[PDB]
């Protein structure tokens, strides 16, 4: 006899508003909950939950209703429900959902509620009705039986909804190859595992919680410039889908003003930290110390002057640097602007590259571009996609940053071409966990990830080339994201 | 039910003068011990061979330990076996046929409930005896890529294209290459043809949804399986889309591959690879040369279509001698940002080292993140004939002083270019390893703009229908003649080994 909730709820657990749903429609959430309630089924819905349908949908249909009142033409409660289950139709009748609130709660407070099917609306809305608080809350944001969840979907959105899928639980050729097999996997301490309990992993975070784990159960220990000490392993892949949401990590809070700054900063082409430090964004400050500088052979550089680097590689390669505060406009190779404008006359050339690796000018820059190169790429239907080369990948600290970073980049420069975002295509070289950050990392793959949230663009109409852009024309709509997770920078 | 089990040279060579024809291969006897030996308690194997093949054996590792000797002769007693040595403790007394139908007739009679499973050990006789009666279920063929001198064969049968060029016996099972004692081989299985969980199944349902290489072929450890793989996955999923050549292409975007460099070499065996155009190039690159008839009159004319009047003439490039490839490739990785001229002008000293750099920085500090080599460089592009697909290199060592390579392809003609381009830095990952005193370990692909041209389309589908054999090893000859990367010559190296499939013609994109 078990039984199963299915429920589509904001973070602050919020399902409905004026008996209806406070969230606009949901397309692939509806597709999900008629395919998830038959395979005949039986459903099982409150008074008020059944006038919330609209008529032509009122008869669910393949599926046996049950609406529960004690005023219309129907058990008189939920274990009358059951009863009426067990009973009649005890053939026929596979498994049992139940679909709003006060129902919810008895199901729950009579503990006959075996699984959880929630969609996690990654919004918060207006709402006058609630889901009842349980042990597993943590799954929605960050406020004896408790449920684990086992599955975690990849993020979906509709009408400028991000939204996820979880489902949660109360807690002769082959013997012939086989002693092959056998052997060869004979040779060759304890594995760890990001959230082991969660056997179905859609979620795209997984990807970089699974290469944190494999980095510290399979990489090397090596020693490095800082002298901290790393664990590494060489030549890694990951992807992040753009059509439906944006890769901001959930299981930590990323710094997007850092990420957004940055990025306007790298496209002015921009040297000058100290205008990224002025703004509370001092990712860079550390590196552009004079005793870095000093340490690098520079001693003739300004405090802030990260040389002739990243930005200034993109809009004037090749041209000769002096200082921070030289004109530049004219000189050089503006990589950026070729790339956009062999997008936007002929994208199926294969040379639409930006490399900032100018041997030429390594020497001349405070540190060597990380994030060196990246490519893109069109298809028929209008999608852009683009892969970026790392060089070297802080695991820890750096990556989901970069993630983020070119991930924007690529919203960016899909909006200035009249194209599509599709993808980012993320190629890494050396790619290393600081032996000081193994502990929290650690930490941070016992969370499970949240739905990723949508980045926007706002003022499209304003906004005709790349250089247009402000820190103001971005909204992240839908980042619940677990606490901040402190990573002390080896410099 | 018998299966047999083997040892083998591609033109079916196992033995001579009542011995193996190859040095030790130690990890081919741990396969055979546990093939033949591994069973799930009660019962044990029983391993039948020739009486050649039971004197060819060592005294002390006869008879086999833990499995059932039958030996099939007609001069040799049971009693010879039996005063040969003695029996140890717990052990099977070794027992003598006339033949291998006596020997399964002994196995039935007197040894069923006793006995799992029966090998076919050797040799040539038994194989031929074996094939004959068609008892043979499955065959656990050892490749052996060298050729050895051999004066015993095994037979031919149905489906022996796994070894050479030329009811069946079909490959289920083809393993990644290994190699001992300068031996290159792999390992194959053929067969004779002729609410825990479970209720979250509904949600993958509707989250749930043609061409394939080699489909029976099940287990797939050959790394070539990459490759062919990575065709099939181009051409179902691909895009179909336009192209700069007018030609039509099929691409796809971000790909990866890696191959494995301690054991063989990656030269694909699926087709045949222009091994000495790899070298030529790879020594040309190395040299920073840009004169591709230099590449041309030494037999590779992989260049020319790219340096002719016309094209350099189409590429906006009248002032170019015909054959100067302007500063690409070689010119940036040995004089990066140097000013070019034409490829008759010395540049010794202009512009950046890259590739002397790498390799002191190897020599010197393998724990440096900045060791690349790049070709890319915006500011000659348009001075280039063709603008550089392998554009970036990278190299890393790690605890057991072991270099890894990855490269970055922009752009990848996979029937055509890729196997080159993995054949050639793999080979530059082992000069520089050879020049760094290092181990290689591994060069890894990133692939940028993946495609096939639409006229290569039939002869790829083609090539899926053939199953990939044992890479080769390539040999660094005069290593201690060669201490810089400049020291390579072309004589100074050896494919060994190395069986491919014929070659299949594929006109280049224009
Ligand atoms: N986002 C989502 O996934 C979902 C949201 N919703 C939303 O939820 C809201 C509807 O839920 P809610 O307003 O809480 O009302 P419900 O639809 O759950 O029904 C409440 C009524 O059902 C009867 N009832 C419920 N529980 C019991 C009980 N334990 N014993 C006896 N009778 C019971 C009572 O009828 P009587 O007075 O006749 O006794 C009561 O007035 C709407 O806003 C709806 O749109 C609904 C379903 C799913
Ligand atoms: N690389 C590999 O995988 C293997 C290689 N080898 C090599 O092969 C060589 C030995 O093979 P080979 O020379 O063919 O010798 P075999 O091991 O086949 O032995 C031949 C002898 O066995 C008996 N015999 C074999 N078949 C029959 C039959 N059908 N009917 C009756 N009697 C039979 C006869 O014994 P009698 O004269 O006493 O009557 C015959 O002289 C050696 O070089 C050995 O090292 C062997 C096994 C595996
Ligand atoms: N995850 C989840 N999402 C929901 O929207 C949801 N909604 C309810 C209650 N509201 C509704 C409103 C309309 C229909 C409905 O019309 N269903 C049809 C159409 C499915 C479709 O549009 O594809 C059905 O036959 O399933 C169902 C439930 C209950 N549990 C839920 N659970
Ligand atoms: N694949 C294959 N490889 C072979 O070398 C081979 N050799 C023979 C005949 N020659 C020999 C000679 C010695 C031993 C031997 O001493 N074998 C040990 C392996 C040692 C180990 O455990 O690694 C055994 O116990 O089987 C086996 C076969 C027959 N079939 C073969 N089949
Ligand atoms: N070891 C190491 N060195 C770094 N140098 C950086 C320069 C700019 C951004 C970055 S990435 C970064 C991204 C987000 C937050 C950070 C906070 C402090 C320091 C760096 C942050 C780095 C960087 C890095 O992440 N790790
Ligand atoms: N469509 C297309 N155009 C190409 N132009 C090239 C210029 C240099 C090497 C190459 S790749 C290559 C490189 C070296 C040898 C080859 C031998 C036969 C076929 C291709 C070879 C290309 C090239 C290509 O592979 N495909
Ligand atoms: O965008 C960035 C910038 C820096 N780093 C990290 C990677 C390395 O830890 C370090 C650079 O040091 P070298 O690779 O230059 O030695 O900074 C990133 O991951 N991403
Ligand atoms: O080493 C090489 C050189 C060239 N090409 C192919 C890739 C493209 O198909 C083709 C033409 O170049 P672009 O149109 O991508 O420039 O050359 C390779 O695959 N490998």
Known sequence: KPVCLVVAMTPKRGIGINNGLPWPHLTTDFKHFSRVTKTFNAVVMGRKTWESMPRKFRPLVDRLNIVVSSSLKVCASLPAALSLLEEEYKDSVDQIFVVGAGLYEAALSLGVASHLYITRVAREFPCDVFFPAF???????????????????????????????????????????????AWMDEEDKELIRAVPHVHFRGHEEFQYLDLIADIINNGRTMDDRTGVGVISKFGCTMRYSLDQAFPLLTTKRVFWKGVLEELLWFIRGDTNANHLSEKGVKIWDKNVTREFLDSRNLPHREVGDIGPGYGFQWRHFGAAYKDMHTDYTGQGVDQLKNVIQMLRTNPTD??????????????????????????????????????????????????????????????????????????????????????????????????????????????????????????????????????????????
């Open 135 to 181: 042990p597993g809350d943590d799954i929605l944001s960050n406020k004896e039986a408790t449920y684990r969840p086992i599955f975690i979907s990849k993020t979906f959105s509709d009408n400028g909804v991000p939204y996820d899928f979880v489902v949660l639980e109360k807690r002769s050729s082959a013997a012939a190859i086989a002693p092959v097999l």
């Open 350 to 491: 294969r040379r639409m590259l930006m490399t900032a690796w100018n041997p030429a000018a390594l020497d001349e820059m405070a540190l060597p571009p990380c994030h060196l190169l990246c490519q893109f790429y069109v298809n028929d239907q209008k999608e852009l996609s683009c892969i970026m080369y790392q060089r070297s990948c802080d695991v820890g600290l750096g990556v989901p940053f970069n993630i983020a970073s070119y991930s924007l980049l690529t919203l960016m420069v899909a909006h200035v071409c009249n194209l599509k975002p599709k993808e980012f295509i993320h190629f890494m070289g050396n790619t290393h966990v600081y032996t000081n950050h193994v502990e929290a990392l650690k930490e941070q793959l016992r969370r499970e990830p949240r739905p990723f949230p949508i980045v926007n663009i706002l003022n499209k109409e304003r906004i005709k080339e790349i250089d247009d852009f402000t820190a103001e024309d971005f909204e992240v709509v839908g980042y619940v994201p677990h606490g901040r997770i402190q990573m002390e920078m080896a410099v």
